[PDB]
Amino acid sequence: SMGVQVETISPGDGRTFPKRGQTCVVHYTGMLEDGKKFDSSRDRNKPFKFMLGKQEVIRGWEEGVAQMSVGQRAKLTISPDYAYGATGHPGIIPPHATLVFDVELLKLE
Amino acid sequence: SMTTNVGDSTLADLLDHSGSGLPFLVQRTVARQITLLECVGKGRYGEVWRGSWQGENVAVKIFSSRDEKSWFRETELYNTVMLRHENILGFIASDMTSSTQLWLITHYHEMGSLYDYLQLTTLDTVSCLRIVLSIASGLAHLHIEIFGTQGKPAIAHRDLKSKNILVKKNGQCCIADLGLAVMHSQSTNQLDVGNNPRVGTKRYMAPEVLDETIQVDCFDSYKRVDIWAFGLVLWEVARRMVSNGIVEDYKPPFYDVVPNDPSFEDMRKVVCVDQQRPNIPNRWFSDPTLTSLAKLMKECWYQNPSARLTALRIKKTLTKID
Ligand SMILES: CCNc1cc(O)c2c(c1)/C=C/C[C@H](O)[C@H](O)C(=O)/C=C\[C@@H](C)[C@H](C)OC2=O
C-alpha cells in the first residue's frame, strides 16, 4: 500500500486485525536497504509494544502492522516519507532511507 | 502502577546493553510517552525540561531552531559511540517531530548544574576534591581513544563550562552537551569536526581560539582547548571551598574585566592582548588543598597550549591530593 509494501512470510489468523487504540505486541528486525541491521527486538528477546493511532512509531510501521492479522509475520518495505524522511536519524538511519522490517504480530492488548 | 503490565521494563532495563541509549526504534516510542513537567534550563540552545516516563524522571532538551545542528551532532555521537561513563551525562533517546521539534532525552540529575550548585552552597575539602576529580575523570574518558569493538574514538568537548556540568546525588559531576564535540581515531587519523557553525562559550575560549591561531585540522589542539576551560572551572569551584573560615563569592571567570555576555573582542583583549588570567586569592596559599589546586590551574592556562598538561595527568594529580 501507500508508503509500505507488505510481503507475507507466514499467515495470521486472517480475522483479527489491529484497531485504533489497541496495543500491538510485535517482534521486529529493522534493516537498511543494504541489509544492515540496525535494531531487533528478537536479539534482546523482548517483544515491543505500541498503541495503534498514537503515532508512537513511524507511519509505515504502523500502517503495515494495521494490515496484518494476529500471528502474521511479514516483511515491510517502508518508503522514506513513511519512515525518518529527509533527516533520517543521526548516526543510525541515513537521509531518505527506505527501511526493511521483518515484523511478527504476536498479540493485541 | 495501575497501568503496569507484566513485561514492562524500566529505563535501566531498556538501556541494558549499539549506541549509548535505548534501542533505536524504542527511542521514538519512549520520547512520545514522556510527560513534560518543569523547565530546568533555558538558553540560546533552547530549553531543558524535567519530564516523567513510567514514573521515572528524565531530562528533555528541546532545541531552538538556531541550534538544530547541535541536536544532529549530539544525537549522531551518542548513537555511534558507546559513551557510558559515571562522569558523562547518560543519553537515553533522541526524537524529532514534524515546525519541527527536536528532542534529546537524558538522565535527570535533580541536583542541577554545577554553575547553579556553586551559588547555592559552599564546599569543603571532600566535596571540592570530589567535584573536580570527577570532572577530570569524565574529561580523560572523553579524550582517550579505546581500541577494539567495545571502544570509542577520542573526543574533545569544545564547550566545557560550569553550566555544562551537572551534579549527581553522590556529589560527583558529569559532563554534558556534546553538540560541539569533535572525534578522532588513530587507526585512520580521521578527524571528524562535523558541520556545526556553533562556537564555544566566549568567556571560556582559550587564547588560541580568540586569536585564531588554533590549528583546526589537529585533534590535539581541541584537547588543549578543553584543558584551558577545565582550568577555569577548577578556579570557579576552588573559590567556593572554605578554608580558615574564609570563602569567596561565586563569580564566573573574568568577572572583573568583561561584561555579561562578553564579545569576542572583549575576551581577546583580556586573554590575548593583555594576557590576563584569573586571580588566585591570597588565602588559598594558607591551605594545602587550595595551594595544590592553584598550581594545577596555572598548568592549564599556559599561553603555549603544548605546555598544558593532559586530562589524564590532571586526574592523576587530583587522585593524589587529600
Ligand atoms: C534541578 C535539576 N536541573 C537540571 C537537571 C538536569 O538533568 C539537566 C539540566 C538541569 C539542564 C540544565 C541546563 C544546563 O545548564 C546546560 O545548558 C545544558 O543544556 C546541560 C545539560 C543538558 C544537555 C541536559 C539535558 O540537562 C540536564 O540533564
Author numbering:
A (entry chain B): 0 to 108
B (entry chain A): 170 to 186, 192 to 272, 276 to 499
Paper text:
In particular, approximately 80% of the HIST1H3BK27M tumors contain mutations in ACVR1 (Buczkowicz et al., 2014, Fontebasso et al., 2014, Taylor et al., 2014a, Wu et al., 2014), which encodes a bone morphogenetic protein (BMP) type I receptor. DIPG-associated ACVR1 mutations are known or predicted to confer gain of function (Buczkowicz et al., 2014, Fontebasso et al., 2014, Taylor et al., 2014a, Wu et al., 2014) by mechanisms that may include neomorphic ligand responsiveness (Hatsell et al., 2015, Hino et al., 2015) or ligand-independent activation (Mucha et al., 2018). Furthermore, we characterize E6201 as a dual inhibitor of ACVR1 and MEK1/2, and demonstrate its efficacy toward tumor cells in vivo.
E6201 is a covalent inhibitor of MEK1/2, which are effectors of PDGFRA signaling (Goto et al., 2009). In ACVR1, this cysteine residue is replaced by Ala353, preventing a comparable covalent interaction. Therefore, to obtain mechanistic insights into the inhibitory effect of E6201 on ACVR1, we solved the 1.5-Å structure of ACVR1 in complex with its interacting partner FKBP12 and E6201 by X-ray crystallography. E6201 occupies the ATP-binding pocket of ACVR1 with a binding position similar to that in the equivalent MEK1 complex. Both MEK1 and ACVR1 form common hydrogen bonds to E6201 through the kinase hinge (for ACVR1, at His286) and catalytic loop regions (for ACVR1, at Lys340). The missing covalent linkage in ACVR1 is compensated for by a van der Waals interaction involving Ala353 as well as two additional hydrogen bonds: one involving the threonine gatekeeper residue (Thr283) and the other involving the catalytic lysine (Lys235), which is displaced in MEK1 by its distinct αC-out, DFG-out conformation. Further structures of BMPR1B suggest that this kinase favors a more collapsed conformation of the ATP-binding pocket that would disfavor the binding of E6201, potentially explaining the observed selectivity of E6201 for ACVR1 over other BMP receptors. E6201 dose-dependently inhibited BMP pathway activation induced by ca-ACVR1, whereas its effects on ca-BMPR1A and ca-BMPR1B were more modest. Taken together, these data suggest that E6201 can inhibit hyperactive BMP signaling downstream of mutant ACVR1.
